[PDB]
Structure formats: C-alpha cells, structure tokens
Design a protein around this motif. Structure first.
Motif, mmCIF file in Angstrom:
data_model
loop_
_atom_site.group_PDB
_atom_site.id
_atom_site.type_symbol
_atom_site.label_atom_id
_atom_site.label_comp_id
_atom_site.label_asym_id
_atom_site.label_seq_id
_atom_site.Cartn_x
_atom_site.Cartn_y
_atom_site.Cartn_z
ATOM 1 N N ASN A 381 10.722 -48.121 -38.562
ATOM 2 C CA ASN A 381 11.348 -49.150 -37.716
ATOM 3 C C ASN A 381 12.194 -50.108 -38.574
ATOM 4 O OD1 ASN A 381 12.093 -51.378 -36.154
ATOM 5 N ND2 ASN A 381 9.946 -52.027 -35.766
ATOM 6 N N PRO A 382 13.438 -50.129 -38.214
ATOM 7 C CA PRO A 382 14.414 -50.929 -38.852
ATOM 8 C C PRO A 382 13.986 -52.377 -39.059
ATOM 9 C CG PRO A 382 15.389 -49.775 -36.926
ATOM 10 C CD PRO A 382 13.947 -49.336 -37.095
ATOM 11 N N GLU A 505 6.085 -50.303 -39.630
ATOM 12 C CA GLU A 505 6.095 -49.673 -38.287
ATOM 13 C C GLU A 505 7.031 -48.450 -38.157
ATOM 14 O OE1 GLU A 505 6.664 -52.287 -34.511
ATOM 15 O OE2 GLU A 505 8.523 -50.952 -34.366
ATOM 16 N N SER A 510 15.980 -39.350 -34.627
ATOM 17 C CA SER A 510 17.147 -38.570 -34.306
ATOM 18 C C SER A 510 16.989 -37.072 -34.506
ATOM 19 C CB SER A 510 18.303 -39.001 -35.163
ATOM 20 O OG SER A 510 19.112 -37.857 -35.454
ATOM 21 N N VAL A 511 18.034 -36.359 -34.116
ATOM 22 C CA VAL A 511 18.158 -34.946 -34.287
ATOM 23 C C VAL A 511 19.658 -34.694 -34.301
ATOM 24 C CG1 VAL A 511 15.888 -34.406 -33.157
ATOM 25 C CG2 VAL A 511 17.885 -33.888 -31.928
ATOM 26 N N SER A 512 20.280 -34.854 -35.491
ATOM 27 C CA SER A 512 21.716 -34.637 -35.726
ATOM 28 C C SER A 512 22.280 -33.411 -34.989
ATOM 29 C CB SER A 512 21.913 -34.359 -37.202
ATOM 30 O OG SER A 512 22.226 -32.975 -37.370
ATOM 31 N N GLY A 513 23.549 -33.096 -35.195
ATOM 32 C CA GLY A 513 24.137 -31.963 -34.482
ATOM 33 C C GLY A 513 23.745 -30.679 -35.126
ATOM 34 N N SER A 514 22.892 -30.823 -36.119
ATOM 35 C CA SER A 514 22.456 -29.648 -36.814
ATOM 36 C C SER A 514 21.463 -28.987 -35.872
ATOM 37 C CB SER A 514 21.893 -29.959 -38.212
ATOM 38 O OG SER A 514 22.392 -31.174 -38.764
ATOM 39 N N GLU A 516 21.050 -29.349 -33.150
ATOM 40 C CA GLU A 516 21.803 -28.953 -31.998
ATOM 41 C C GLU A 516 22.562 -27.640 -32.242
ATOM 42 O OE1 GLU A 516 20.418 -30.879 -29.999
ATOM 43 O OE2 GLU A 516 20.270 -32.977 -30.862
ATOM 44 N N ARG A 517 23.315 -27.515 -33.314
ATOM 45 C CA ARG A 517 23.969 -26.239 -33.422
ATOM 46 C C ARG A 517 22.939 -25.221 -33.826
ATOM 47 N NH1 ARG A 517 28.548 -27.147 -37.564
ATOM 48 N NH2 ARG A 517 29.087 -25.033 -36.712
ATOM 49 N N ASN B 381 15.192 -51.487 -29.322
ATOM 50 C CA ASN B 381 14.037 -51.268 -30.207
ATOM 51 C C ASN B 381 12.784 -50.932 -29.378
ATOM 52 O OD1 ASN B 381 11.767 -51.369 -31.880
ATOM 53 N ND2 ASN B 381 12.052 -53.566 -32.404
ATOM 54 N N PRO B 382 12.281 -49.778 -29.684
ATOM 55 C CA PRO B 382 11.129 -49.246 -29.059
ATOM 56 C C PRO B 382 9.967 -50.228 -28.968
ATOM 57 C CG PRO B 382 11.878 -47.766 -30.860
ATOM 58 C CD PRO B 382 12.850 -48.922 -30.725
ATOM 59 N N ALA B 383 9.667 -50.867 -30.119
ATOM 60 C CA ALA B 383 8.514 -51.741 -30.189
ATOM 61 C C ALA B 383 8.619 -53.039 -29.528
ATOM 62 C CB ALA B 383 7.674 -51.768 -31.454
ATOM 63 N N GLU B 505 15.010 -56.669 -28.606
ATOM 64 C CA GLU B 505 15.641 -56.320 -29.902
ATOM 65 C C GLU B 505 16.390 -54.968 -29.909
ATOM 66 O OE1 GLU B 505 13.186 -56.588 -33.816
ATOM 67 O OE2 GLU B 505 13.668 -54.346 -33.790
ATOM 68 N N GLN B 507 19.334 -52.048 -31.946
ATOM 69 C CA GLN B 507 19.480 -51.344 -33.216
ATOM 70 C C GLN B 507 20.504 -50.204 -33.275
ATOM 71 O OE1 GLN B 507 17.495 -48.369 -33.735
ATOM 72 N NE2 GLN B 507 15.414 -48.895 -33.251
ATOM 73 N N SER B 510 21.279 -42.923 -32.431
ATOM 74 C CA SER B 510 21.539 -41.523 -32.647
ATOM 75 C C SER B 510 22.964 -41.084 -32.355
ATOM 76 C CB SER B 510 20.643 -40.695 -31.771
ATOM 77 O OG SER B 510 21.352 -39.518 -31.370
ATOM 78 N N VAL B 511 23.214 -39.819 -32.651
ATOM 79 C CA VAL B 511 24.449 -39.155 -32.381
ATOM 80 C C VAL B 511 24.078 -37.682 -32.285
ATOM 81 C CG1 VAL B 511 25.904 -40.941 -33.570
ATOM 82 C CG2 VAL B 511 25.630 -38.825 -34.674
ATOM 83 N N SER B 512 23.630 -37.256 -31.082
ATOM 84 C CA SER B 512 23.242 -35.872 -30.770
ATOM 85 C C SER B 512 24.170 -34.819 -31.399
ATOM 86 C CB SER B 512 23.353 -35.680 -29.272
ATOM 87 O OG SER B 512 24.486 -34.853 -28.999
ATOM 88 N N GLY B 513 23.939 -33.546 -31.118
ATOM 89 C CA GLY B 513 24.771 -32.510 -31.727
ATOM 90 C C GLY B 513 26.075 -32.400 -31.016
#
Lengths: 868, 868
Positions: A381-382, A505, A510-514, A516-517, B381-383, B505, B507, B510-513
């Motif tokens: 957590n950021p 925490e 994420s799940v990059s486009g990798s 995904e591809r 933010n999830p939390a 809060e 943040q 992501s950036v999906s595929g």
C-alpha cells in the motif's frame, strides 16, 4: 560406449543426456565459441552410478580417462603433471537449469608439486597459487569436507591482520601460506586424509561427488518441489580451465541478455577483475556491473555482446552466460536461458514475439506455468510505504515487496511457518543448505551479494523477493539480531521491497498487458473451459476478472454455518421428526435463496455448479460445553439431551461416515431445502433480469447409481415443484462427484442418472491412497526423505494411481452418456500438470481457486498447445 | 437541389452532409431496416440557414415540403390532417455523435383537431392524446418556450393528487386535460402564441430551432471542447412516427451492443413498456434492462439481437440504437457507434481484433486519442474505501471513483473550480443546460436515471464518473442540501464510485493489457519518438513507465529555487563582481551535479534535453520585506541595499525581458555553472556505470544566431574544459528553443550554431498571438462566447498562426542542417492534433508531461497511421 560425450560430439537436443548445461555448451561448441574444449559426463552414467551400488566403475572411469586424454593432447598440456600442468574445472550439468543449487570445482588437477610447476610455467606463482588456494577451498567444499566457515575464516583473517585491502593484493608467499594452512584446515576437519593430491583423485573424488551429491537432502527437497524427478540425473561437464584470476587484465563475469526481474531488453549482470568465476562474483567484493566493461575493457564488450546477441537469438530466449576474460581472452564457460521472475518471464515473451523471435504459440509454452502465482501477490500500500520508516536501501535483487518477522537462520525461518506467517531471512549470504528457509520466507535481505549472488538468483525462480549486497547491516547471530540505519532488530516484522528499500499494509495488484497478451493467447490455443470453485460472489467477481468462465463448485456448507443460519440446522438435528426437521429446513429456505441470488446476479449466465451439503451433522454442533449450555436452553432441551445427541453424532472417521449424498437419504429435506433455494433464486433472478440461468445441482459422495437415483428423484420433484413461478421452462442438470472409488469404478453405470461428472481429487486421492491429507502430515516428509512419494499427493495429480479412477470414469460414463461433461474441482484442479493430464484425460471444464485460475488458463493453453 | 436528402437516397459516406445520424440511418435504410422511412435535412443547408441571416428560406422550405410530400404519399397518411393524420418525429443529426446534447421533437404534425382525428383513426384517444400531451412538452421545450419545470409540475401534480400510480394509467380524459392545461402552460409562459397548431408551423418552427439552437451557449461550449467546429452543422432527419406509447405491447428502448463502461461484449441497455422514446427511458420510471425483453417480449429479443448483431458487424464497432416496439412492431429510430469510456474504448478494440473484426491498424485510429487521460485518474485506496462510511448505492453509470465537495447546481459546481477542487454534483437529473457543471466535477450522483439517462451517457465521454437512478436521496435545493441513508449533507466532500457505492484516499492505477496492446501497437505504427518534459527523476521513472523514450526538456529552475540552493544565486545577484557571482555560481556546482546524476542514473541511455536557466533574476528574490530582512542580514548588506537591488530587477513585462539566453550573456557564469554540473554528472555517471550519456544542452529564448553563438562558445569551452575527467570522448549537442518569432524566422540561419531545434509552443504561441496565457484569461471566454477563437490557444496548436513559425523553422533549419532533429516541448506537445501536426510537420521527437505521454503514443500512432 557413450557414457560420456564430447562437446563437439553432441548437441543441445541430447538434453536427456547432456543436460541443459552440457548440451547448450556443445551447442555453442557447434556454433564455434570462446569455450575451452572439454567433455561432458552423461546423465545415463550418473543414474548408472546409482543403478549399481554407489561408486564409479569401469567404462566410466575408463572414459573419464579415455577422453581426459583426448583433452591433454588436444590441449597439449598434461593432466596434473607436476611440471607444466593441466588444470580443469568440474561442474554439474543436469537437465533442468538450477541456479543456486549446483557443484563446480575450479582449477582442478593441481598439487604442491604441479602448482609450483605452474608457478614456473605460468611465470607467476601468485596466479597458479591463488588458483591452488582456490582449488583447495572448492574440491573440499563441494565434496563437503569442510564448512567454508573455515577457509573463509583463514582467508579473511589472513588479510584481516596483515592489512591487505583485499584478496587481490595478497602475494605468492602469503597466498602459498594461505593454501598451505588450507590443506591443514582441510586436515584438521578431516581424520588425516591427503587433500586428494593425485589428479586421478581429485577428479573421481568429485565426479562421484557430483553424481552422488544429487541424492542428498537439499537437492531432493529443491529438485522435488521444482517439479524435477530423481529419475533424471546429474551431469558433469569437464573442461579445461580459463583463469579470470590470472591478474589485472583477466576477469570473471555473470550476465543476462534481458533484465530478468523487469524483463528489460538489455545486458544485465555482475563482473569482477582478476576474480575467480564460480566464487567472487557470487559473493565478496562489489562486482562491476557488466556495462562498465566498456569503461574497463572497451575491446571486450564488443566481444561478449555481439556474441551474447548471436546466442540470444541462437536460442530465441533470454540467455544467461559465464564469460571469462582469462587474461585479455574471452571465454563462455556456461549458458542456459536463465529462469525468470513471473513478470519478466512474461515481458520477454511479449517482446520476443514483438521482436519477431517467438511465435504467439512458442511464447505460451515457454512460460513457467506454475509461476503465474507471483503476479497476484499482495503488493504494498502506497500510503503506508511512505508511512514506512525508511532505515535502508540496497539492491533490486528480485521483484517483490514483502514483510514479516525477522530470522537469521533458514531453519529458524522454516521452523517458523512457511511463506505467510511472514518470515524475513537476514543472512550474511545464502547457501544451497538454506534452500528450505528460502521456500518459506516472503523476501530476503543479504549483506554480501548482487543480481548474480546465490540468494538473489534463487529468489527469482522462487518468485521470492530479495535485496542482496545490502551492506551496513551489523547482524549478530549469537544474540539473534541485527543492525541497520539506526535500529536494533530482535526477530520481528521487517519490511523489504523490489524497489531497493528495506522499510507495511498490502493489497491486490495489477496485471500488465503481459498477463493480458499471455492470457489472451492462452484462450486462443487452450480448449478446456475454466471455472473457479467459489462460495462468495466477492471471489466470483474477482475470479471472473481472471478469465473465469463460471463456477466448478459452489459450497453450501456456510449456508448453514454462517452467523445466523447456524441454530436452525442445529435445531433440525436436535430434532426428532421430519416435520420438525422440515420446519427448520424450511427456515433457512429464504436465506440460501439470497446467497444464490447474489452469486447468480454476479455470474450473469456464467455456469455454476452447486454442490450439495457435504459435512456430516456433527460438523454442525457446538463441541463446546459452553455453546452447548447455550443451545440447550434455546431448545427447551436438557444440556444433557443435546450432548447425548451430540454424542450419537460421533464418527470414528469423519471422512468416510454419514455425509453428503448419504446424508440427504435419511433427511431428503436437505435435498428439499437445498433444491428449492437454488431453484427459486435462479427462477426469480432469471426473472428480474431477463437473463438465463441453468442450475447445475451437485450430489457429492455418490458411491453408486441407485443411490443418486434416490436423491435426484427428490431434487427433481422439488425442482419441478418449485417451478410454481410459472409452469416454467427452468433448466437444471443433476451431476455428481466422482470422488469415491466404487463411484469412479462403476462410472459407466453411474452416468445413467447423471449429466455431469465432477471430479473430487483431494477426496478421491485420500481414498485411492489410503491416507488423509490431515493425518498423513505426521509421515509425509519421510516419503519425501525416503523418496517414496516425489510430488505432494494433495497438490500434484497421482496419475499412476488416482489418474486411473478418473479415467475409467470419464471414458465409461461417456459410454453411457456421450454428451457427458466432466470438470475437475480438487485442489489439483489448477495444476500445470493436472490441467494437462485433465486436458489429455478428456475433461471439459476446470475448477481452481479464484487465483489459481490464471494458472489454469496457461495450463490449459500449454495443455493442448504443446500436447500435439 | 440537394439541400435535403432521402434516407434511401444517401449513405453513411455522405457524413459531411448526413451527419453520423442521418447517414447511418440511410445506411441501415440501404441494408433494409425496421426504420420508418423519412428524410434528412442536410448539413450544408444548416450552415446556409446562417450564411444568410438566420431564418429558413426557399429551396429548403420548398424541399421540406417537396419531400414531406413524398413521405405522405409514400406513407399514405396526411401531414397534420385533422382527420386521419400523419405524425412525425424531428431530431438532430450532426456529424459527430453527441449523446446528451441533441434536439428531437416527438409526435409532430398534431393538433386539437388532428389529435381527435387520430383519436378516432387510432381507436384510442388515450394513445394519440398521450402523444399529443407529449408533443406539447417537447416542441416547446426544444424550441425553449417553457422550462420543463412546468410541464413536469403539471404532469407530476396531475397524477400527484388523483392517485394514479404513474402516467401509464392516466385516461383519455385526464390526459386530454393534461395536454389541455399544457397549451396554457405554454401560453402563460408565452405572450399568447398559439402552440404552433399548424403543422407547417410546428415543423419549421423546429427545423429552424434545430438549425439555430447549435450556435447557442451550451452547444458552443460542449462542441468546442469536444473538438468539433462551428464550421459544421446540425442536421435534422425527419421521419414518420412510431409509438412505443401505443399501449402495453409497444415499448421504447435504449441499448448498446457491448457494455460501454467495462467493454463487456453483450447487450447492454434500458427499455420501457408503453413509453415514449426520447423521454421516459432517459428519466422517470425505472427502465426495464434490455435483457428482460426475453421475459417480456420473447419474440422481440430475437429481432433486435440478430438485428443488433447484423449491425454490430455492418459497422465493425460498438453499436448504440433507438429501437421501438410501436405496438408489437420493431423499429430502429436511431444508431451510431456510441462514444465509450477510456477502458471500454480499449476493451472493445482489443476484442474486435480478437474477434477478427478490426485490424491492429483500425483499432488504433479508432480510439479517442485524447481519452487515454482517464486511464491515469486517481483510483481509490482500498484500505480507506472499507474505512469509508457506506450510506448508499445505486448505479454503475460510468467508471470512476471520485470525491469532493457537494453541489446541487452545475453553476455552483463550475463556479467552484474545475474537476479537481473536488466538486460533486448532486442533481435530480441533468440537462444540456448543465453541460459546464458536467465538465468541472469529479463524478455525479443522479436521483432519476440509468445507463441511458442524460447525465450517465455524458459522463462516459467526459470520462467523468456517475451514479444515476440513485433513489432515496431527499435533496432540497432551497436549503442547498440533500439526504441519503441516515445523513444530512451541507455542500462538502462526498464520495462516489464506478462500483455502485456512494461513500476517501486516492492513488496511482493499473493499465490492463489493453493499454498494452494499444500502446504496443502504437509503437508499431507510430514514427515520432516520445519523451517527457521532466525535472524530477520520480517522474522519469513513472514516465519511462508509460513508454517514454527520454526527456524533451529538463528544467533547472528548481536547481536554484530548491530549499538549499536558494540563497546562493540570491547571493550572486546581490553581488557586484563576476568573481563573486562565479564563487556563488561555483557553490551550486555540486548541487545540480547530483540532480543530473539522479536523472541520468534514472534515464539509463535515454536521451535528455537539458534546458538552460529560464526565469530572470527577479524570480529569484524574496518579494517580501520579511525574507528581505532575512536575506539582507545574512549578506552583511542593508535591507535597503537589497530592495534597491531587488528594484533594479523589475521588468514591466517579465515574459519579454532579461531572461534565458540573454541572461547568460552578462553572466556567462550561469552557462558555466550549468555546463559543468551537467558535464561532470554525465561524465562521472558515464563512469560509475559504463553506460553512455550524451548531454543535450538547451539554450532557451534564442532570438538570433550570433547570440547563441555567444553562449555556445561559452558552454562549449567549459564542456570541453570539464573533460578533465579524461581528455574525454564525452558527447554533447547544443540545441535551442525555437520559441520566439525572429528565431523561428531566421531559423535557416539559426540552425548554423545548433544541432537541435526545440520548439517552445506555449511561449511561442504567446508571442505569435499577442497575449499571455496569464493575462488573456480575463477575455479569453469572450473569444469563446463570441466564437473568435474556437480552441484554447495554449492547449490546442494554432496551426493557421503559430504552425507557421514552426514550419518555417523546421524546413529552413533543415536547409542548413539536414540531419537536424526537432522535438516539441510546449503544452501542446502531447495533443491528439498537435502530435499529428508535429508528425506531418516534420518534427522528430515529442515531449509531453509525464502522463500525457500515453496520449502522445496514440497520438503519434494515429499521426502517421491514418495520415497516409
């Protein structure tokens, strides 16, 4: 013949024989490479060492010598010739690459006579000797005759009293003193054995110590879990030496073609000037980042790179090599497309296709299917990280951002729960004899090391995080602690991250486009469907997210257990009379109606297998006297009357008693209540959305046909009676769990009353084996130690044993019911093997835990892909 | 002729004329569709309405009537015939789709005589009348003659005293009473005009009110910002009516082929039974989710779907239609591939290729390039969310998870800062006259609505979040507040999310595929490089992340400003003597050396343009008397001596004074200090890594050649003198900002002392225009109101004006210096247009803010892609 092979007299194809090592080397050798010729001692011959007693023999000895001679001449030098010697390196070439786990004795075939003889031949006693001090530590170490602790303590102290900045400045006198006091350091710890001064004594003493180490503890433990079998073998490519230790124009370096943590296309690695390969790069003396080799040896870089490249392509996959500038001369001691990290394994492939190199196809098969699991580890957590007390920094050694209690021993690690209690492992440096502490820690901190170090490299494949060469750390093992920044740490919660810092925490990631591809393509090539074994829509959402096509099993167990359904079955049970037990059952009616509704509403058309109640009544009653005092009162019954009733509920064996389908055979009201809630919720939900929902009703624990005929005749009449929300057109198939031996057995009869065969493999395994996943713990490890069972029977699909029960069933139930769908629910449901066995086995759908789905995607991709 | 076109006598290609609407309709018409024939009143003719005065004339009137006759016969009914009428619908067809912003008058050509006449013809006075009450509200409303407030207040009350559950049960008497009291509701608010009872009076009164509304405020404001020009036009397709209001077997529905928030392939939308298209679906009476049309009209669904599909494909892009079951009959009033959300715009394309439909190529061009910006909005933010007081829930109307102060007026919204102060907008329902409150809010809450509602639909394209049909909300405008759950909200911080809930809060996200296969492909088809205008490596990291190839501009401004560099230039300035001003300058030497080092170390080989100091000395001195008292003391100078010196520093015009290159013309020490820090940091960093670094040194504000010759002659000698870290081989190119008129002007001479032309477009624009981005604010809007300037001159690239200065420069400096690289740094650097103009303009690299890079990827993809 053909016990041993020659680099040039081989290939890479010959892996079964020439490992990943020995075959790739020859491969290079067939391409023409700065590899000092030599030979490889073949795999079959390793296993032969065991398939006979445990010590080398004839043709082998013969050949090690038959070919060692070919070297000598071919190399003009003489093997262990006291005058003008011939040194060699001796290193392990198994099939599968195994960074962190091998054995390589350096500068071999050296002695007090021949060192000196090299000393004079080599116009440099500092060199050959330093080499000889080298060989002294190695040979022993490998062949374990001494704990490095020693050698280390004498080298270290040696300089660590004279002044010497570092080993690189110790002289011919001091060295020879080192490797003098070294034979005795080998002596003392031994009962008086001559540190194998006969070259026909160092050699065999090792080749055997290669072909014999394998079958030892750590290797068994690693190689097991790593999905390798002992049915394979160790290799040992022997070749001439090259010396990155000659002096200040000869160097020893570790390297990779594309950054293995991130995926980053580009030279990545650690090098040393005048250092000895297999020892200094992997620890002691901050190793020059391979790129600096332009500032350092700007005639070399070109070598290596166009050579790396050349190779990068020659294999079409992220290379990893042992290059050595043995005095202004480049040498490629070793190769192998290194094992990646989950993301990078990904990156490189997306890229490699992007670069025209691999095919969409190739890319897929090429992933380490079980490695996806990493992609879904709890990120940090950021807002906490920033709120994290920075104390240190060091090395992006392996992606991850872990945390937890601090340990200085792998055994203090492991002995503190697996990779989730949260075990950090602070360690001066890691070793092959730390391999079990490696596998049960969130991430590692290492004082001395780099990308190339022992721990680093291993984390990567373990997907475990790691920050190597993390200096300033005054760690004291005695007092079980350690320093950093301005802190004093006593074995408790610490935080490391793939981003240098050594702090927290966590959260979903994420799940990059990798992904995904890679997932995209999986779907393209894969055929078996995928579903998740779920219970809570929350996972249904998060699971559909992962490319989940529905639900393989939906548990009702909670649908009673849950906080407010609880005392209503506890009612029914402590209730003698069907009309009571129905009343009771009729009250939860509503409740589960919701559950289903949520699920459905979540699932939107996606299938959903609904398994009928499983646990016996006993699971459903307070084992406490307390909750018993409670329960009683609220029942107008005596605490004594319940106990008694909580007594008649005792099974000698809870796994094989009164539960599941048999349970609704004397209470078909369970069937009733269960049918209806599913039936109404689907009906109403199919209404309030106009969307379609075809209940998949699952009878677990069906032993035989006639049985399930009983329960289906119930479920059916109610599901047909529930259709009171319109004469209805409501769909439903009544399937069963092929989780018992008889049931898998008479499958061909079983599929008469059933549409869908749903395989319970953890429960079937437990039958087909003889033990229970619970109990068996107290003896399982032995089967491991003793090499009886290789894989875990509860994780990995017993295809020799259980795989039969499942295959008689699929192909027999499809004798009676051709259009018979089959899907796998057991834990082995999402298993890079299983999901291949199940694929080639005939199954239709799949079913893994919400997160193991993506492993089920790839798996099924692989499954058919590479299958034929 | 050809002022108006016939559906059948057109196409989709004819867009410039037949809008997205009128051409797509005919398109369908050419395919054969359940579209009641009609005609479209062409675009050229709309503009002709203005290119003449402001009122309809001849050929047009002629044609509206020439063809209205073709309908009548073709339709056998009579236009506004008091006996057995002919009704029609009148709706706006501009080029670009514009959900939320159009005009469509329903059931037109009706009157007190002809209603009744329909009443009898239609065997149903409830129908035609309800229709007539309908037309009464619409015609007016559109042609604005009444605030709905009214009609609404009379319909509402009408039922809202009689009892009537809802409008659908009001009778022929009550209705006719409604549409009776309605003419007077139109009357009262008017000065006594007959609610256009002559059909040759409703019509023109509207077609003109179509071809005339456009040029009004909201449309100008929306259509501007939406990248549309007023040089285009409004269309108005007129066609026969179809009535989803006939009764309980005739319905009116909104729909989409693939979920437009998520991308989800599948029917998505809202329908009503016996409702009137353009009014009830988009508000009042919870609209049946299109899928329920199976439970409702399971003979219809098939229609629509195989029809939707058919169309889905006929266009190869996410369709959006107005279907109507005008009493058991399906009708497609309208189409257009609806505008998406950023992710879904994405999804659909990845998919559409996945489905073989589009090409990698097509997919790219097809994205709304400026829409990427959404992808990088602050997620929740999830939390915290869990830590968020749930109060309500409602509708996943548009993805996003926003928050901030609460407003009940768009004008109270807008008047409260744009989309970042954090303005929520709670509103009963939104309107075309809310369009500016829409564009300055984080997300919207709507009491009455759905996916199809006014606000929803608009959020989507605005990328703004929205939760429509969010009931239980007792909002009171008078007391400027609102209810929910168990709360009382006074205009302050509220939280809404794309996931139902109306809570936080934030943040990074992501950036999906998708982004990946879209970005992947961009790189494939795009040619101009990309770089970010950065200053802090933190962004260098986060920017490289986004597919950034380096840095287009690196600012040094802070390299002085910063917390500890501050009083060292403030020294130098309040310091008469070069040896002092050098001393001073020599002290920051180290400091910036670090800055660069970090950057470089970050950038690893990636280029990096380093722009020389910009701000004049004045920017560098405390304007306060306080910090002045400070400064003084520490200088051993008098508070009076500094002021005086802080006085000689006053520019009448800070933009066009003593700054940038001229600045280091009388202090070439700035040049000196600047050169060196960059020079040493690159040198040392090129050392301690072995990696390559070729300083790109940028002289800003160069007016002419000889000038830059001055500064380069300095920078060079030091950069050549800095190479004291080895006689060196250190690379560097000295480039300049083509940000002034003369400098763009004599570009062909300018490129003599320079390698790289770096375009400053915000600063150039400000020259080439005459105003400053600062000042101009106090009159810019007028240029907007008055339609003088269409686009923002500081956002959008003045290609008629500024585009010249930039093109004389590129193609002249490339006369003297062919191998001349050019890159764009101005704000317009990452601009779906710019990045196309710059592409076709001849530029090499690009340079946008860290986050606008991904917009720069697509942009450059589009740029060349579609270019030729």
């Amino acid at each position: 013949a053909k016990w041993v092979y020659k680099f040039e007299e081989g290939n890479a194809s010959m892996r079964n024989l020439l490992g990943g090592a020995g075959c790739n080397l020859a491969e290079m050798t067939i391409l023409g490479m700065p590899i000092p010729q030599g030979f490889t001692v073949t795999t079959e011959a390793c296993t032969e060492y065991y398939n006979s007693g445990k010590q080398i023999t004839q043709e082998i000895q013969d050949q090690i010598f038959e070919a060692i001679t070919w070297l000598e001449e071919l190399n003009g030098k003489k093997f262990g010739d006291t005058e003008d010697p011939l040194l060699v390196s001796v290193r392990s070439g198994a099939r599968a690459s195994m960074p962190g786990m091998m054995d390589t004795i350096l500068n071999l075939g050296l002695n007090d006579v021949a060192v000196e003889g090299f000393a004079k031949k080599t116009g440099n006693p500092r060199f050959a000797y330093d080499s000889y001090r080298r060989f002294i530590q190695m040979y022993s170490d490998v062949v374990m005759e001494v704990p490095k602790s020693h050698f280390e303590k004498i080298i270290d102290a040696m300089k660590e009293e004279k002044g010497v900045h570092f080993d690189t400045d110790l002289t011919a006198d001091d060295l020879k003193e080192l490797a003098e006091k070294f034979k005795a350091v080998y002596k003392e710890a031994m009962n008086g054995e001559e540190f194998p001064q006969e070259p026909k004594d160092q050699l065999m003493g090792a080749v055997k110590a290669v072909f014999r180490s394998w079958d030892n503890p750590r290797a068994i433990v690693y190689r097991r879990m790593n999905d390798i079998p002992g049915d394979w073998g160790t290799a040992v490519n022997v070749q001439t030496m090259v010396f990155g230790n000659k002096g200040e124009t000869s160097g020893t370096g570790v390297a990779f073609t594309r950054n293995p943590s991130t995926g980053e296309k580009g030279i990545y690695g650690e090098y040393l000037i005048n250092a000895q390969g297999e020892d200094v790069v992997a620890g002691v003396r901050t190793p020059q980042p391979i790129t600096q080799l332009e500032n350092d040896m700007p005639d070399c870089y070109k070598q290596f790179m166009d050579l790396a490249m050349k190779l990068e392509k020659h294999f079409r996959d992220m290379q990893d090599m042992e290059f050595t500038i043995e005095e202004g001369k480049l040498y490629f001691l070793q190769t192998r497309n290194g094992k990646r990290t989950a993301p990078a394994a990904l990156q490189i492939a997306c890229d490699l296709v992007d670069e025209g190199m691999i095919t969409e196809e190739e890319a897929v098969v090429r992933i380490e299917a079980k490695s996806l699991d990493q992609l879904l580890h709890p990120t940090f957590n950021p807002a906490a990280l920033k709120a994290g007390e920075v104390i240190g920094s060091a090395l992006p050694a392996s992606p991850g951002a872990a945390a937890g209690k601090v340990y200085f021993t792998a055994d203090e690690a492991k002995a503190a729960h697996e990779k989730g209690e949260r075990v950090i492992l602070v360690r001066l440096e890691t070793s092959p004899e730390d391999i079990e502490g490696m596998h049960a820690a969130e991430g590692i901190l290492t004082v001395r090391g780099g990308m190339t170090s022992h721990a680093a490299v291993v984390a990567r494949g373990m997907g475990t995080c790691c920050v190597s060469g993390c200096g300033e750390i005054k760690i004291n093992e005695e007092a079980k602690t350690f320093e950093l920044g301005g802190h004093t740490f006593a074995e408790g919660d610490y935080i490391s991250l793939d981003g240098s810092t050594g702090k927290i925490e966590t959260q979903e990631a994420s799940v990059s486009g990798s992904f995904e591809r890679i997932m995209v393509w999986a779907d393209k090539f894969r055929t078996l469907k995928v579903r998740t074994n779920a219970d809570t829509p929350e996972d249904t959402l998060n699971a559909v997210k992962l490319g989940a096509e529905g639900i393989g099993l939906c548990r009702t167990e909670h649908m009673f257990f849950e906080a407010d359904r609880i005392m209503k079955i506890r009612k029914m049970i402590l209730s003698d009379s069907v009309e009571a037990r129905e009343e009771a059952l009729n009250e939860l009616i509503p409740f589960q109606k919701g559950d289903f509704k949520a699920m459905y509403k979540a699932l939107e058309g996606r299938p959903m297998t609904v398994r009928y109640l499983d646990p016996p009544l006993h699971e459903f009653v307070p084992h406490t006297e307390e909750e018993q005092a409670e329960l009683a009162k609220n029942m107008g019954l005596t605490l004594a009357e319940v106990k008694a009733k909580v007594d008649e509920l005792h099974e000698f064996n809870p796994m094989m008693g009164h539960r599941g389908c048999r349970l609704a055979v004397t209470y078909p009201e369970i069937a009733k209540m269960q049918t209806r809630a599913v039936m109404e919720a689907a009906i109403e939900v199919k209404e309030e959305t106009g969307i379609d929902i075809v209940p998949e009703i699952m009878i677990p624990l069906v032993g035989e046909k006639k049985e399930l005929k009983f329960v289906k005749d119930v479920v059916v009449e109610v599901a047909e009676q529930v259709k009171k929300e319109k004469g209805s057109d409501m769909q439903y198939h009544i399937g069963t769990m092929i989780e018992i031996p008889r049931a898998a057995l008479t499958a061909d009869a079983i599929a008469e009353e059933a549409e869908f065969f749903s395989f319970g493999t953890n429960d079937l395994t437990q039958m087909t084996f003889g033990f229970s996943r619970d109990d068996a713990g107290k003896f399982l490890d032995s089967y491991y130690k003793a090499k009886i069972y290789e894989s875990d029977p509860f994780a990995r699909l017993d295809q020799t044993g259980v795989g039969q029960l499942v295959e008689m069933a699929v192909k027999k139930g499809r004798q009676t019911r051709p259009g018979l769908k089959c899907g796998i629910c057991g834990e082995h449901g999402g298993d890079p093997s299983s999901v291949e066995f199940c694929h080639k086995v005939g199954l239709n759908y799949v079913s893994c835990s919400p997160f193991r789905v993506p492993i089920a995607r790839l798996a099924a991709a692989q499954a058919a892909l590479n299958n034929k």
